[PDB]
Subunit: 437 residues, 3 copies
Amino acid sequence: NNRYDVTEWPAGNPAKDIGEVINSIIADIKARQGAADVDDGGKPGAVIYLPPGDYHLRTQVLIDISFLRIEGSGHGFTSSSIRFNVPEEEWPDLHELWPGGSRVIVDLPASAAGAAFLVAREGSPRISSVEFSNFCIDGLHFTADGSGRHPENTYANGKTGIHVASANDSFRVTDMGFVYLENALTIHKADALSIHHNFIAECGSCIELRGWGQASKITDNLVGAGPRGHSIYAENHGGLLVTANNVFPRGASSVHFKGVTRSSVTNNRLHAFYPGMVRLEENSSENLVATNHFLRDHEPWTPFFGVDNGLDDLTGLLSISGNNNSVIGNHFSEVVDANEIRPEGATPVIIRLTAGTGNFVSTNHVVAMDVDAASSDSAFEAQVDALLATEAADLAVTAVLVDPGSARNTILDSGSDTQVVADRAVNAIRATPTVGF
Amino acid sequence: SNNRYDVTEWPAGNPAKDIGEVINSIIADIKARQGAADVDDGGKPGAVIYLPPGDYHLRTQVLIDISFLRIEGSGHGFTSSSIRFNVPEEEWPDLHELWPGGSRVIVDLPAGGAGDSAAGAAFLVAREGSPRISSVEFSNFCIDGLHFTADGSGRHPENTYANGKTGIHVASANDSFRVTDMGFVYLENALTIHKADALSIHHNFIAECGSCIELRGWGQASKITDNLVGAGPRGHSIYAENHGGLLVTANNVFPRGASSVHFKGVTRSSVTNNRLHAFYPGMVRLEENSSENLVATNHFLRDHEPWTPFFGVDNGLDDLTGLLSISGNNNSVIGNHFSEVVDANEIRPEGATPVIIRLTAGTGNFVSTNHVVAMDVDAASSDSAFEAQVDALLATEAADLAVTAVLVDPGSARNTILDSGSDTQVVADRAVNAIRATPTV
Amino acid sequence: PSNNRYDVTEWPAGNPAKDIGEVINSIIADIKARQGAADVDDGGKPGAVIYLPPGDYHLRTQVLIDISFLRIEGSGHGFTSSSIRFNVPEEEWPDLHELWPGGSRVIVDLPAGGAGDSAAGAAFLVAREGSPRISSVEFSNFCIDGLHFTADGSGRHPENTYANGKTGIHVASANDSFRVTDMGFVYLENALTIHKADALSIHHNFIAECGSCIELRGWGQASKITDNLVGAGPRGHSIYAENHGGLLVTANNVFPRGASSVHFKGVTRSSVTNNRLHAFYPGMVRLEENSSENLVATNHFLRDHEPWTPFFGVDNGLDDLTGLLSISGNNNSVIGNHFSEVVDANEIRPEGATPVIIRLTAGTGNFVSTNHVVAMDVDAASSDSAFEAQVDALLATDLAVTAVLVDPGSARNTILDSGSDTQVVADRAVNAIRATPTV
Ligand SMILES: OC[C@H]1O[C@@]2(CO[C@]3(CO)O[C@H](CO)[C@@H](O)[C@@H]3O2)[C@@H](O)[C@@H]1O
Ligand SMILES: OC[C@H]1O[C@@]2(CO[C@]3(CO)O[C@H](CO)[C@@H](O)[C@@H]3O2)[C@@H](O)[C@@H]1O
Ligand SMILES: OC[C@H]1O[C@@]2(CO[C@]3(CO)O[C@H](CO)[C@@H](O)[C@@H]3O2)[C@@H](O)[C@@H]1O
């Protein structure tokens, strides 16, 4: 009946090497589904179920069939980052130490070769409608990389959760948990992909859509990356929809586009500890960036307090290099220690247009305030307190900076005249109305 | 064991008579088997408990005190108990069915003592110490409080929204929880979660409950998405307090909560792209220093209750309250649609001009590009609920009604109000706020 | 089974490969026989779940669902582009890794319905009248496949007609709290048609290469269509609703080639917000027949030319004066949308016209604010290589357009920052206009 359970397959042992078990199942599916056109069918695929459990993976799974679903019964997330920064003598008193759910532990050496699941098939048609649902992929530990952070804080292990190498259509990744992977999810050459309602956190990079793609969506995810990685990344995508995500720290950025066109980054909650939250680069054009909530503030947790993404406060929270984009209805909260602003004496920048023409920036609210950077060892207490604290002085900021290399833009109701730094001769600027008469 | 349980395949007890006892027995088995936290890089992976479609009475509270427990069913099982309890009782035997169904947990607990609502919860999630309980999942089953009871309100008992029962109560600090695809019906409180971090309440059906979603204590980085929600007139549809970075989006919130969305001390959050329908003022309330929030591209409809049993029941608030009321600093109210569809004779107080957006306190609020449409209609009532409701929603033939689109109280200043009403429609001190009237002809 | 769980491959004497319809009907009869009493121990008709493992199942008998709380579920949406495959030369088929959709697959082998009886061609029909309304039926994570399109006198190749008389799911009766989630629909004349819906959720489906995808008919209320991937055919609807109040349409990625992306008739107090919409024809979003008090906000619209040869000369019959967004109704709100108009200046229809982006044909009190129009002139070219041609066209980057056209039959509108003065064609005496500032 094309239904398998990894704990009820006579070949191998999923506790020791679930990779071998799953590859054996896939070989069985192929052996039984050899003919493509028998009675209007022949290759319907299969479903492979992972009950809740701790499964070591020592052999990469190769998925080269369409319509394979791999499903579990728990995303299984717990903060390994918090736990590895608890003093080791306290670990015996903790209720648990590891992630759980339907848990695949990635015991591969260190980039597609370090992926727990590799989806690859060349030829025609494109591999289609593979589904990953409601299980946990855990890369266990981060390791030394010469960064000189403690090993468990490097976000480096050469491991990937799911890597799709080949052109693909109608794929789904839903309800997953990804934790402690250098890369959670990397999908090349995607068409009509849906990455929906996952929890992708404490991974160096979370979601990367590489090569090219079209007509895809990234919706309703909880996402948190590492300071040298991407939270959500796309390159050469057309018609991408990125919405209803709650992106929290500490990726280098929240959303990073290279050569992305005719796409929408709308209605997300985005929180970063560094500038450069949303980056439209390398001729990213005709995109809508609307009604997102941006918060940029300082890391409040001591283990990462001095760690950042190398970008200064002139970068912008939103940076655009490309033509004919639309930036409408966003909220930006800029909550920083004025003494720590880099470069020394700079006025921080919120929206920066570095290149391109015809960008329309309208109806954006910037709120900037000056607050001392607190540092505490208790992660979630420090995080919640920092989010709720509004004890602050108003801070002068540049709402919109148009560099001379970007021209013929339209900037409306996105800051006062002094807040909008731009050549009025070659841009259409309307300052937000002033108080009074 | 492979950590998978089915409540109809357990040796002891009877899930029809007391599924709570059965589930607690299963949880005890999980804990007995998963005692070690660090064996081969694991040891406490949790489990899944499956509820096939069926009618299951719960007479003992389920206590969930382990991480990575999933409780799942095969239906959300909603039917309108409200409509059925307002059909004359003598006609009940002729109806195709009466009760909710799906994978149905019937909450047969007594109400908890004063200040102990947790005792009336079918499922209580609680564990202290470290780390925080994490990644518990509730999926695709039905929780049914069965009846509402007499409470001194003067309403018929089944219309009180009172029974002291909760569906799911999370008492302890928690991380990465999920509540998805559920059906909640006829509970005084559907879902109450304290101290939530990175919670997702997604694609549920939470209706005919006194209060639906309440996020209490504090929280962060959570989301409430894609839900169908309808509460009762003394209760909350979506409530949060002391949350930062909450995202509330893609919900369809219908009557008859006291409010649609109610924030106390909520900061740096977004209430965006929801459809919100209320029968009373005070639909979206930002209170007690609720600051730096985005309230964008929502569709607000306020009209009069059209169903006879509730025609004269309301949330106590007059039409000067506002549909959206803000007490806090630096918020952003952008791109919303407001439909105010009321019978002028029914406006309270007598002869008042209704208020749409009210800024009661705070500075730096940015209100831009909001369309207000106000219509003077009649008070049509009908005994047939679905007929009355559809007829009222589709009826747009009406005369104009003068409203105050934006009211800025003296307690609020240094706000910016753009293209959200004509000069007459914006009642505000021009000296201390930045005001641009919507252009008119 | 006493526990109300059924697997179609375990049904005694059933053969779901030959006729899964007969199997599912037999299961429904079994459920009804066991669940006869409505009020025993505060219950009695809890419903059931029917599971379809991955497999190829022919349906030769319509399934009739007339009980509340029935869930039909599978383990795979199973989509593959039968459209691409049927346009690959037949001599190349043997080298293809697969030819057909899969997953938990219901192949609809029903004949077309009689005149005015399209419900007869539905694989699943949900119907029950009387009280209470049928409630909380769920369809989840399976594939419905109408296999082939057939000749219809259009002159297209048979597999490109989008015509077969088949429906995936047809709900005929008033309904409450229904769900359609995680489905795949392919090669059906109509994917999903739901009449008289209350508090419906159509969420996270893949509904493509169907003549029409989602149709909400009759009337309805308090429903939502969210997070779907949708692509229809040139004579049909992508998302259609009539006489709905309080509908929420959001977070959908609608790609070609429906006649429209979103089409409302008599829809009120609803929201079409934060969708990505891509069409090859004008008339992408249509608010018609007194569609009033709707929010149309922060959508991304792209209109360009079909790049794939088999459909290059096929369209929806509408010219470039139609508008990408057309409104006939009162008191709507059009806010924060992006429009990309990417067309061949030499081929604009009618000859010599200037394309229209937003058109108000009738009604009063519409508020149109803060919309960005981007228009460009690109030569229309054809190639036979579907996904290469499609991706290339999306990635490829002036033309004069009318951003907002207010016909004389619509008045008392407010148009702000949605076009230069030249780009707004409207009577200034009876509409309030603020031109986007220029340089
Ligand atoms: O609060 C959101 C999430 O934050 C945690 C805990 O906090 C962490 C610790 O590394 O720091 C960042 C938040 O600043 C997150 O990437 C990471 O993961 C989740 O445990 C929590 O779910
Ligand atoms: O229309 C959405 C929902 O409304 C019903 C029916 O109507 C009710 C009856 O109490 O009144 C309110 C709506 O005005 C809802 O809270 C409630 O529940 C669901 O039967 C229906 O799903
Ligand atoms: O790219 C989105 C979807 O497009 C396909 C392939 O392209 C098609 C072929 O008929 O043309 C339209 C898009 O122009 C789609 O309706 C249709 O289906 C899916 O294979 C693909 O998932």
